[PDB]
């Protein structure tokens, strides 16, 4: 393929290996999720605009909408965590080990 495709795929892999190794902080993992969503959006719209597939231009923006359909949800899964414990560390989420 081209060059910008390689760079966007490299960015996606960089954000993927950023996500898969946690650093004791949930917000950083949520930022990694948003970054992978952004990389997928950019790759999709790059391919669509290159191939002149006009009717698929409804695809990325609609896709972007569903980003919040998890991302904001992740924040709603944090506040109860931050009400259970004083911080948002991922090492405090080990009660389900027995």
């Amino acid at each position: 393929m081209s060059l910008v495709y390689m760079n966007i795929m490299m960015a996606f892999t960089v954000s993927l290996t950023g996500l898969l190794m946690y650093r004791s902080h949930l917000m950083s993992s949520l930022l990694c999720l948003e970054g992978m969503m952004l990389s997928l959006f950019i790759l999709a719209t790059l391919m669509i605009l290159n191939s002149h597939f006009t009717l698929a231009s409804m695809m990325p923006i609609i896709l972007l909408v569903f980003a919040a359909c998890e991302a904001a949800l992740g924040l709603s899964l944090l506040v109860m965590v931050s009400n259970t414990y004083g911080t948002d560390y991922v090492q405090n989420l080990n009660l389900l080990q027995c």
Binding site: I61, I62, L64, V65, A68, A71, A72, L75, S76
Partner: protein, 115 residues
Amino acid sequence: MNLMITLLTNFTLATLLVTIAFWLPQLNVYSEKTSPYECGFDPMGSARLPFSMKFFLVAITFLLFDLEIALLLPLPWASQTTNLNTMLTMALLLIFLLAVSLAYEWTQKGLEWTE
């Protein structure tokens, strides 16, 4: 071509007004002037403590609402299509669902602040 030239010009004009503001005058730095200002007395605790927010629910609602109204932004261009009844019905349905979500937030005391 012109947009990056304008961006670089404005960035250069902004960033030149601090190095002029830094290297020009006579400076006198001691370890009492640069302390954090808390109305004459030294503060209790740090400024990096958890600042317990109240409007988290409305923040998540704004997170959904920004893009859920960004879906409504191509409505000018959507007025140029041949099929107009379907476009009008879908746009009215979208804003009606927005109004239903806002009313559900209002009635369940979701817009009020905690504590």
